[PDB]
Amino acid sequence: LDLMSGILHCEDKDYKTAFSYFFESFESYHNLTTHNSYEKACQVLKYMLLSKIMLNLIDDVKNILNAKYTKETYQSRGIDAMKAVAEAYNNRSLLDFNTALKQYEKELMGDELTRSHFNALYDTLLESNLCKIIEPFECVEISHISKIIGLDTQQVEGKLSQM
Amino acid sequence: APIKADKDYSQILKEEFPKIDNSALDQLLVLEKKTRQASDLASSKEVLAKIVDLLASRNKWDDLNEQLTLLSKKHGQLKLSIQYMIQKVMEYLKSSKSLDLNTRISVIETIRVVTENKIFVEVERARVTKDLVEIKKEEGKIDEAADILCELQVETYGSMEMSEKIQFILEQMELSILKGDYSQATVLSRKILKKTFKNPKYESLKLEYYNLLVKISLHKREYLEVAQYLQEIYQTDAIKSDEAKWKPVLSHIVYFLVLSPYGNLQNDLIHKIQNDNNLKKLESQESLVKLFTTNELMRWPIVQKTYEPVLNEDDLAFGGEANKHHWEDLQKRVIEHNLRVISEYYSRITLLRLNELLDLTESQTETYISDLVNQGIIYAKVNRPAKIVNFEKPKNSSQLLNEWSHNVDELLEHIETIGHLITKEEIMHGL
Amino acid sequence: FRLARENAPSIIFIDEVDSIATKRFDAQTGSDREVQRILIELLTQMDGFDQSTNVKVIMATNRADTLDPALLRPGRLDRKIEFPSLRDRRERRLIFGTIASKMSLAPEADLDSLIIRNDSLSGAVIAAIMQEAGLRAVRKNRYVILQSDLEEAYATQVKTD
Amino acid sequence: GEITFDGIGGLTEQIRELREVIELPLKNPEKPPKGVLLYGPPGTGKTLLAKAVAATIGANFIFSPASGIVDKYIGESARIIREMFAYAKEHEPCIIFMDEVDAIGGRRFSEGTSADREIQRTLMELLTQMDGFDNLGQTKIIMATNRPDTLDPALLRPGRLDRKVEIP
């Protein structure tokens, strides 16, 4: 329920709902152990994480990741994807997500939520990464900017008009 | 308790007969019954200690274990009772070894009261903890070694004796290192140390910990905090040690301070007084602290080349494997500070003139800009089109708010200041 | 009460208000005359004051029959809440999960050992049993708390005579 | 107290049992106890227990008879009891011993108003100090009854009473 709750509560957001549902559910699954289809706990957690990560509060994410109980002393590419995402999220970096994104894709796309949300959510990175390091003035070229973000231009023109 | 002594003396012979020739019961049986779980005459724990020792001397220290294991289970004369002998047994288990460490290892988790908690006799069940760990360490047992020792603060002493306890708290902190988790060390650490000051302060207990505290700081690499810790009992080791032995701390301390991206106290910590403690250098250190207000970053590779006897080059009390943990960390560090006076001294500048003075690529520069930009600590422009950075200004402070009020403050100084004196002055002069 | 409105937002709680619950029902002379007013006051102040709620009246009750509907009047005491709930074992398990967190216990003390033992009881008692047992270990001079210690307390506390 | 636990010995079950749940929890920071209620025939050593209790701890034994706490005296409840609390709370360690508390204790009657509303308050004033955050800091409370079943069920509760002291 808490799982499916967030599974509703992810798309409409209310990550907190989702996460908390995820949390408690995960906590259950954390205790529910093998009775739970095992990693489903962490799968909850992954969403539980990504909830906070879509909510973009990383300390909890980290602390959750950090506490082995929460972590379940368990580790997977999604986990570090989540991490690297969050760091990339800290990074305000185009690539740093794509970095994790491409690599950790396993246990990443496998989460359609993440596969759906994050990617879009990652889109903000471009706008997020962009503000990550500002700024120009009454002068600058997209290829400054493209280079400034170390990217191209074709997709840049569409990022500039995105006020 | 007469027969407790008398029959002991009687069984003394009786055992010593079969001790020379088991009579394990004979000795036992007396107090075994007598004291049991319920005092008949009770006894002196000695009477049983006697029994234990007669066993001890005679039997295997294997047997005695199992024996004690059993006899403990019943009572003793009190929980305290046997495990004292069981403790001396540990030295005796040690006063053989290997299998008798394994016998010990057997003896160990027989009853916790050697490495761990049933009784309160931690003054012992703490000792063998490390004493087995000390072997466990040698055994390559790490976690487990830590794990038997992970529980001190709680099960064991409420710190009935810290001095004992703190040592293993230390050692826990120590094992925490081979473990790698400060946190074990942490709670211990964060709890313990003031009380060392609250000891008739015992420098060792500082220093030992204070060195852990260092080693904490080392893996930590938070250099204010690092040197700050240092600074603490560094204050103690001019007191305690000579300055001489004590300098390298400092020589690293301000070094750490410089290792730190900076500190505001570091800005206070700048001069101290005797600092540039006026024998070693120890000085380029503070001269670098002085090289700050003038900082250049034409200097960086220079000063690097200039200094590394230990200076850039330190694995000693700092963990730079390469000097990067100085150098690289210090790279930005100088660059960091370099930007400060730069920050002061530029209305406008080109990226070039920067990179000229700053000896870097744009991006790095941009980043360092972007850094303190993203740090908000400086001002700049992100201008590629000009390839020039306005160092800017927050011209919207509305200024003349304060400035004209300060222009008034000028008079609120001047005519206020200057005025009060003048007529007074020439009259203070009179004549 | 006003001070809370002066401090708005705030809280008004009352331990077991029933002490003032029933007024003079009759000519009750001393000390019953004010419990009229005090109640009437509170009544007046519940029953007479705004709904913009920066402060919430809250009152414990073991025994509510001393009260009257004037408190139970709507707009005033709207929301009743009742301390009980079959302790359903999860809750116990939570209470068990609760205190054992704060309480040192050997490897004998076992929650789900008690969770089956424990059904249809009260949490205070549960709260007791936990460190009631907590007593017993140290009462046995035990640096560690067993199930026995629990059992004792439990078995002690299942009935008190 | 006048004579120690031993002189009345033969209640030894309680003698120990109470001491550990009363005296010791002071000296071992590792709940403190809420409350302890004698019952059985008084003075058997029973009332004396309190003194014998009071003797062993070192706290100031503070005896409470009941009705004076609300004679008439159309009020004086917490002010009484809190002075009994607070003085003790300042003067702690203190033993609080409330005699045979069925006039100022117990669940009352129809729970109607005889001035029972005085009692309930008074009944509750303790409850307030007990189920309320007020702890026994170094001051402890001995409850007294000759019959236990004569008391408010809520009074017997932990958070108020952690011990129901029999005296067979």
DSSP-assigned states of every residue in B7-61: HHHHHHHHHHHHHH--HHHHHHHHHHHHTSSS-SS---HHHHHHHHHHHHHHS-H
Indicate contact of A with B: 3+ CB pairs under 8 A. yes
List the structure tokens of D134: 């007020």
B279 lies in the same domain as B384: no
Rounded to an integer, what distance in angstroms lies between the CA atom of residue B354 and that of residue B335? 11
B377 lies in the same domain as B284: no
B37 lies in the same domain as B161: yes
Resolution, expressed in angstroms to one decimal:
4.6
Rounded to an integer, what distance in angstroms lies between the CA atom of residue D9 and that of residue D19? 13
B86 lies in the same domain as B177: yes
Q: What one-letter code names the amino acid at A58?
A: I
Backbone angles phi, psi at C54, to 5 degrees: -95, -15
Q: Using CB atoms, which chains have 3+ pairs under 8 A with C?
A: B, D
* Contact state of D113 with C24 under an 8 Å Cβ cutoff: yes
D110 Cβ under 8 Å from any chain C Cβ: no
Interface of C with D (CB under 8 A): 15-16, 18-20, 22, 24-25, 28, 30-32, 35, 62-63, 65-66, 104, 124-125, 127-128, 131-132, 134-135, 138-139, 160-161
Residue at B14 is within a domain: no
* Contact state of B117 with C141 under an 8 Å Cβ cutoff: no
Rounded to an integer, what distance in angstroms lies between the CA atom of residue C152 and that of residue C130? 10
B383 lies in the same domain as B247: no
B335 lies in the same domain as B370: no
B422 Cβ under 8 Å from any chain A Cβ: no
Do residues D129 and C96 lie in contact, with contact meaning Cβ atoms separated by under 8 Å?
no
D117 Cβ under 8 Å from any chain C Cβ: yes
B44 lies in the same domain as B141: yes
Instruction: Give the distance from residue B314's alpha carbon to the nearest chain C alpha carbon, in angstroms.
Output: 46
B59 lies in the same domain as B152: yes
* Contact state of C32 with D117 under an 8 Å Cβ cutoff: yes
Print the domain residue range for B291: 22-345
Residue at B176 is within a domain: yes
If you measure CA to CA, which chain B residue comes closest to A139?
B385
Rounded to an integer, what distance in angstroms lies between the CA atom of residue A75 and that of residue A62? 13
Residue at B11 is within a domain: no
Residue at B401 is within a domain: no
Q: What Rg do the C-alpha atoms of chain D give, in angstroms?
A: 15
Experimental method: cryo-EM
B214 lies in the same domain as B362: no
Spell out which residues of chain A touch residue B386, defining contact as CB-CB under 8 Å.
137, 139
Respond yes or no on whether the N-terminal peptide bond of residue B16 is cis (omega within 30° of 0).
Answer: no
Neighbours of B39 (CB within 10 A): 15
Rounded to an integer, what distance in angstroms lies between the CA atom of residue B262 and that of residue A152? 37
CA torsion sign, B335 to B337 to B340 to B341?
A: negative
The last residue of a domain, from among B311, B345, B379: B345
Q: Count up the domains in chain B and report the number.
A: 2
* Contact state of C104 with B79 under an 8 Å Cβ cutoff: no
Rounded to an integer, what distance in angstroms lies between the CA atom of residue A104 and that of residue A98? 10
Q: B interface mutation test: which of A140, A145, A146, A156 has the most B CBs within 10 A? A: A140
* Contact state of B386 with A139 under an 8 Å Cβ cutoff: yes
Rounded to an integer, what distance in angstroms lies between the CA atom of residue B406 and that of residue B398? 12
Residue at B422 is within a domain: no
Bridge partners (DSSP) of residue D98 are D64, D143
**Side-by-side strand order, sheet with D60-64:** D60-64, D94-98, D139-144, D36-38, D163-165
* Binding-site residues from annotation of D: 40-47
Please tell me whether residue D17 adopts helix, strand or coil conformation. helix
List the structure tokens of B377: 């600590």
Spell out which residues of chain B touch residue C143, defining contact as CB-CB under 8 Å.
117-120, 155
Residue at B308 is within a domain: yes
Residues 6+ away with beta carbon under 8 Å from D130: D34, D35, D141, D159, D160, D161
Q: What one-letter code names the amino acid at C17?
A: V
Q: B interface mutation test: which of A141, A144, A145 has the most B CBs within 10 A? A: A144
Closest CA to B65 of B44, B85, B79, B47: B85
Residue at B328 is within a domain: yes
B200 lies in the same domain as B293: yes
Nearest-CB residue to C141 (from B79, B154, B155)? B79
B38 lies in the same domain as B175: yes
Indicate contact of C with D: 3+ CB pairs under 8 A. yes
B229 lies in the same domain as B211: yes
DSSP-assigned states of every residue in C13-44: EETTGGGGTS--SS---TTHHHHHHHHHHHHH
Residue at B428 is within a domain: no
Closest CA to D104 of D133, D134, D84, D90: D84
Instruction: Give the distance from residue B155's alpha carbon to the nearest chain A alpha carbon, in angstroms.
Output: 22
Count Cβ atoms within 10 A of the Cβ of residue B344 and give its class: 0-12 exposed, 13-18 middle, 19 or more buried: exposed
